Design a protein around this nucleic acid. Sequence first.
DNA 1: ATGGTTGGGTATAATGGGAGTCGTCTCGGATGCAGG
DNA 2: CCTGCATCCGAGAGCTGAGAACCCAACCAT
Lengths: 93, 210, 1091, 29, 178, 158, 46
Amino acid sequence: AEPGIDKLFGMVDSKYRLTVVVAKRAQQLLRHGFKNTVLEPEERPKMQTLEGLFDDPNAVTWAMKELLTGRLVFGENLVPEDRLQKEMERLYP
Amino acid sequence: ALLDNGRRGAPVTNPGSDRPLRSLTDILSGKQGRFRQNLLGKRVDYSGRSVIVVGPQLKLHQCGLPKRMALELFKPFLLKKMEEKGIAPNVKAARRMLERQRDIKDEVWDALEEVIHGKVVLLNRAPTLHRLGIQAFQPVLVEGQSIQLHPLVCEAFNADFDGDQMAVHVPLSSFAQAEARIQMLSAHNLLSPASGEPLAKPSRDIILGL
Amino acid sequence: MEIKRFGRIREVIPLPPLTEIQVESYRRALQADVPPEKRENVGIQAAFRETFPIEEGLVLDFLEYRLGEPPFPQDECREKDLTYQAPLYARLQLIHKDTGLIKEDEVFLGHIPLMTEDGSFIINGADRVIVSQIHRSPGVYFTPDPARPGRYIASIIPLPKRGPWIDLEVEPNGVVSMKVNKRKFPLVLLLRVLGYDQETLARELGAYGELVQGLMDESVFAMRPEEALIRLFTLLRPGDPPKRDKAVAYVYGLIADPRRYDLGEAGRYKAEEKLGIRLSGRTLARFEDGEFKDEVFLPTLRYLFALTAGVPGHEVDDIDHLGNRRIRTVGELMTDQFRVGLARLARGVRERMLMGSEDSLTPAKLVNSRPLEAAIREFFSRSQLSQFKDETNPLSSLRHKRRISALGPGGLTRERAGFDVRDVHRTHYGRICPVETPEGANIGLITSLAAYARVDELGFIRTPYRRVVGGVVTDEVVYMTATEEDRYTIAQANTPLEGNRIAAERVVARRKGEPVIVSPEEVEFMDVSPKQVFSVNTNLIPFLEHDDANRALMGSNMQTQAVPLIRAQAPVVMTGLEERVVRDSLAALYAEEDGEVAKVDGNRIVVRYEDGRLVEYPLRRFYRSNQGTALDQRPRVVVGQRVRKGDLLADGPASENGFLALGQNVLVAIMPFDGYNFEDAIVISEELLKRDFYTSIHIERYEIEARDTKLGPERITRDIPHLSEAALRDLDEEGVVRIGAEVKPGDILVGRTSFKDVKDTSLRVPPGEGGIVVRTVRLRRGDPGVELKPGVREVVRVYVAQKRKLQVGDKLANRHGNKGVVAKILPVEDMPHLPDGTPVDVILNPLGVPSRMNLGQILETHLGLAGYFLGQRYISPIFDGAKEPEIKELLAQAFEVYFGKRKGEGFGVDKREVEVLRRAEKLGLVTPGKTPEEQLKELFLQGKVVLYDGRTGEPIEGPIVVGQMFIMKLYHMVEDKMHARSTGPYSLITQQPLGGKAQFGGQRFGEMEVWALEAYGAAHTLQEMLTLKSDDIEGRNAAYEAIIKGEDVPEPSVPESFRVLVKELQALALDVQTLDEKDNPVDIFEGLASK
Amino acid sequence: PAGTGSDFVRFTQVVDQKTLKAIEEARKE
Amino acid sequence: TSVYIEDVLHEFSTIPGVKEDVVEIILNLKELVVRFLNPSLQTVTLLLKAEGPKEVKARDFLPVADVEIMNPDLHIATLEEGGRLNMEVRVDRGVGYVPAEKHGIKDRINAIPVDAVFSPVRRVAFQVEDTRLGQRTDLDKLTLRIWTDGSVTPLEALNQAVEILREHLTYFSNPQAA
Amino acid sequence: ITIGIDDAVIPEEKKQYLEEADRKLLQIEQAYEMGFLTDRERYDQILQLWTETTEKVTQAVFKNFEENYPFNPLYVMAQSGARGNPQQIRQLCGLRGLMQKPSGETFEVPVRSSFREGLTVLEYFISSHGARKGGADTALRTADSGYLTRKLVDVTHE
Amino acid sequence: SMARPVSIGEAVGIVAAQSIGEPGTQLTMRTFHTGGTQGLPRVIEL
DNA sequence: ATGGTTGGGTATAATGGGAGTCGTCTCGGATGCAGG
DNA sequence: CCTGCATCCGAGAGCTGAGAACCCAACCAT
Ligand SMILES: Nc1nc2c(ncn2[C@@H]2O[C@H](COP(=O)(O)OP(=O)(O)OP(=O)(O)OP(=O)(O)OC[C@H]3O[C@@H](n4cnc5c(N)ncnc54)[C@H](O)[C@@H]3O)[C@@H](O)[C@H]2O)c(=O)[nH]1
Ligand SMILES: Nc1ccn([C@@H]2O[C@H](COP(=O)(O)CP(=O)(O)OP(=O)(O)O)[C@@H](O)[C@H]2O)c(=O)n1
Ligand SMILES: [Mg+2]
Ligand SMILES: [Mg+2]
Ligand SMILES: [Mg+2]
């Protein structure tokens, strides 16, 4: 099972809401090249190859771990989408 | 006859045959018609099928996937990964390399292992009687040509190992992967939606030993 | 190895030729070698005698026919894609009615396909089999009325497409009404046409009471038979003018014309026996002197009335009784098609006769033969009874030739067949196998002829019985139908005998299918053998009496799918039928007479017979069967060897010294193993692969064509642009790959260039295929016997072979219905082994036994252990063979060998053996108070040995069943099934991915998969499946580009199938329009369809 | 209109703490 | 490990004048037991030339230095009058079971790779028996039974097995932190 | 865990249970040969006698397994729920019992042999009717059940 | 399937249809053993 | 300027066709017939 | 006039894999 799946299921009123939040966070992470993450380098998901440890390329794992950290806010009508997108570009080129 | 062939009297047939001509209504309706054959169900890309064998060493969330099957299923991601590395100068060269079996090298398998990291695939056995006839699994690349299935999901699939075959599908986007990993993962579906009783539970040899 | 055989029943007669149902039937239909003066009136001779004479004056009369020699041999027909056939010639005479001018001519009517020696046909270069069809026999039947109890319905049924079914029923008002062509009308008018008065009916039917009073009608009777004829015609054909001659012709053709109405010979016999009358012909009524006379109508009315009155000696008819159901063989079906073609030929001949100068008319000019070829060719290429021959192994072909089908033209339909016609009838005993049938929608509709059964000349299956008189069983054998069988008390074949007298006061017998116990005096007949109850395939399962019928069905079916192996062995335990099976399949080679072997080669044997005549037999080597298996014959004699008549010379495929060899004998242990044999999976040793066990040879054929195009011809050549020599290495100077080259997916087989100034259209190895190129064939235009399609200049075929070893995912099975895929191949050091160091080869899970109830495999394993240690093989006939005490005695001898071997070398009992014996003492398997050797012998007599674990060296805590088992490899191999696709070809109209592995197609995500995705709430995955992966053209293009560039896949659009639906709804004059939130139109066609 | 396609859940937004505050700092102006 | 036969292009063919086809000949050749007298020697090529009519056995191979055939009576082929057999058989050192599709060894163009079963040991058993010594009881007596093919004696195989086990036991001597 | 032919233990009481039955049958025949019984009642009493005898044989088989061989492989499989039910175990050990004609009515004589003892040809042919009928049942009812499922989906999908 | 209150948005109609249909496909009057208004027809009638 | 394609004409007399299909079973609505 | 009662017609019947007149003359197209 996914780690902390019970916690994630208990953090939302509907499991489909959790799926939507995870997918949207993963899209945000993919767009900005993992520069907008709330994880500090020691918590970054790692992947093992012959060359060595690198960052985990899967964005869904990153989004799920970030949701476990609890530093993300989700809800209805928090911020207008256009302003969010413009700010995301401005902070992360 | 043009609108509805074979309604009143003898249907119109082509000379030298007794097969009735297929009118517009014949196209529209029936089990073979447009609605049921092309709209409520379709043939899809990024899919395969193979014989299944028992996977006793697998974990509940894992399935054994053949190497060549994974190569064909994840080909675009693989092309991107090999272009990013130094395996091929550009995507066309990578495709040309992958189109000839003897032109495949060692590092492309490592690139493939990089590609599928964390991703899941969908396994389906016909007939899909309930929703647990499709389940999501993390693929472990194996040698050979047979899909390896966990013993504890066979009862949900109603699968045995006397010649059964299964189909494999690859969800593409972040939304589809999140849905498969959160909602359709095998380790997240342990109780029956019909009765609430456990459906992934010891059976056959496990019960016998315990 | 010494062969020991069990059983006490002695068989008086041998099995009949197993393919005679085809060979004899076609020989009788053709009558090729019979001089024309002594030809009987059956077969195509009957068709000629029935179609002719042609009268319309000029007359055309048939004299005789002959069949020429085939233009090409069988091998040439197979190679050049021709039909193995013989030319047909007919000698005809054109006669003037008055002048008497005789014009005699031999006419070429075309070609008739020829049945080979084994009973198959070569149609367009492919081997085909015609499957026999079971149907309701023609005749007169009486059935209960379902709506009204106490009432009965009479039916007259002719041959298929040879007349209408006619129904007779006593209506509630008492008026008897006959239905023909869906028209109820009183029978009294037809009785009047037949020439029956009030007095005649009263005398012939007076006894039966009020039914005749209710039948009576003076208005019809007062009329003359001519007026009755016209009234009948205008009742049957409302609107048509009531001309006297037109009505005469119509009624004559309906029931009285031999060219239209035809009760068969079987129908005539059935009518005569049921009605107790003698029929003059095969039709319902006779036409002489411009008048109709009855033949069947009055007897059927008498039987119907007597049945309704309850007169003794008249019964109802069972529709599924095998005396009421008959078999049409290949000859009869071919003759029917020939008759249809001859009818077309005669119709054309009459058309041409009624035209043209009568002086310039000759026999040759009148006959246009084309419809005859049309009928025969359509039968032999398109009929569902004409099937692509199954030749995975010789037993497959032998099974296919003995199949009986209820489907086909003029048969039942798969989806609407009820339980009644699919049930094992009591009359199937000894005629149709109750076990071998296909599972699925075809259960009960396709069956198999029993081993001893023979189809008679009328089409009824007969089975043999021994005559017993005064309680003494004789050697006289009588072949009887179900109707004849119903009249006697028949004893079981296993009735104990002393000499040939029945030595038992109580005899188990059958009376009309009911089991009974009778005294020996009451016995009339005895069964010949238990073998006669089951088919050939079911007769190859030893210990069948210990198997449940369902798993026996599975094993009998799966014996057909076994693949020939390069090291095939005959079973350790046989039923005694393998030699006959291999002999009757014509797969091996036998000596025609006593002689001496002169030359032995891998492809040739020269034998010198006593008459000084040298005979050379070529050996068929590495020939691709229809299913891709390689069939070769291997010599089994040396130069100078003395051969008697019938002695084996060369083994065929799946044969070992003249015995059927479908698999291998392996050492098996029945125990669970680490979950690797979970749910019917099988664990094997690598040592099997080390000695090339379960290794098969398979051949694949690839075809390419170079043809003519309007933009320029295609050319097969080596000169191809834009490829390096690394891809051009193996092709020879003609552009075709050289023999012996190893080919892998992506390699070129035949190079071809097509005009665009040329582009590559070469033939390459498909993914997952390849092997060694073993054959190449080039066919060009103009070579003798070649008939290419127009526009095609040349064709190239390449035959590539692979040697397949056993691998994970391959299917194995035994003869008792146990099947499973190999799930794990273990190294030899990990397999469980005997105390002497011998490892087992196969580990089977015991959990498959208790619910399947096939205990025959356990007994086979015990006898195999006995044979393994005694070094011998066994013959165990079904229902008469080895029993438990005999197996215990054999196991006692085997244990003495198996333990004296260890005792002579100076070894006692192992410590692990002692601990296992103590545990088994707890289990109650051995008796306390005995020495370890006594307890080991005790365990051995139960088929169990002490087994050691290869991983640890410690014993398995309990004794384990170990022994030899015969296991076959099935053609379902993972190599042929593994398939995957990312993107590929799409369909023309729906723009959806194609289907099938050969087309590089994709898997179907059907309705129920969509239901499962909906039940999961995975909206986005389902939308991806519906649009981005199937038929959203711009969507799938953008998705592929985004993945190739590293972005995420875009949003989907409307699938093309919905646009197709909208366009097709517009074609039906329906305005389907998509609207936005304000009910304003939204254009999903982007403006490409707006003026 | 079920699961993640339901109107009850499919309009959910997600944002970190850093971006959320400065969007208010823009509104606070 | 490899076989080359004259005027033979692949393994699925026949040779005129020879009773057995190539597949059966290779099956027969897989039973050949060859002993290398020199430990440094890695590969050898045995030459066979025969003309019918005769029974070609393993003894008909041309002699090679430091190479012995342990089963000269092994039947290879049967030749009639007019048949000829010309073979070059490459034999290698190795370990384990290596299929032909893995190594794919070809000397010439028309050579046929052969599945190699390198293990010279045919069968191994061991027996544990009751023994004692003075006052101690329930002691073990071990007996190893080894059947080989003659290329390697049972004692040599036992010594190599002991050496392998000792070398593998050596590996537990370098702890590393995780 | 393994399965041998001796693991299908046949209880002794079965023989007794058969012989006693062969007693009662005679009585029934007598009660019909003298006139105190009609045809339907005789058929029904024979069927009831045989079904009760089959039940007794099943009870004896499982009682023997529980008392003498608690670790017997078939018994362990049936008790643990791994594989098998009492009816199949009885068919392996005690007796198959009554069989049905294709019309749906029972035969008068039962199959008194188990699968370990081996059936006779007549008994095998008698059981073939039920085997074929079950196969046809599966083949022609699975379609009706799938049709019902489709109807339910099209009525509740919203 | 989760032993907790159902989440808003669950397609319970499809789940109900599958739950009713699945046992009928196999276990209702699977392999029948020939040994010594009912079943599916009654359910379809209802 | 050539083939390829299209339109027109034939004169003893002729005057209403022909294959086919009969082994499903239920269920629901539309409907004509019987009674009162 | 109403009603009920046989009668007739139409629409269903699981999923996946694979498999036969001839001739003559004018006329547009390229
Ligand atoms: N959903 C589904 N699953 C099935 C089905 N039937 C079997 N399974 C699974 O497969 C395992 C092994 O079953 P089997 O041991 O029976 O093996 P098989 O592959 O079915 O092959 P066959 O023994 O039939 O050999 P054949 O030469 O007759 O095959 C050629 C002929 O078979 C028939 N046929 C072959 N292939 C299929 C197929 N894919 N689908 C349907 N009909 C098939 C067909 O009529 C064809 O024309 C079982 O346990 C189940 O999981 C089925 O109907 N549906
Ligand atoms: N037409 C079909 C035939 C089969 N199947 C599927 O195949 C399985 C095994 O049927 P099967 O007959 O192969 C064996 P099973 O009944 O499990 O075996 P046993 O009692 O002898 O041990 C069924 O449970 C269905 O899921 C199908 O969907 N459509
Ligand atoms: Mg199965
Ligand atoms: Mg099963
Ligand atoms: Mg099947």
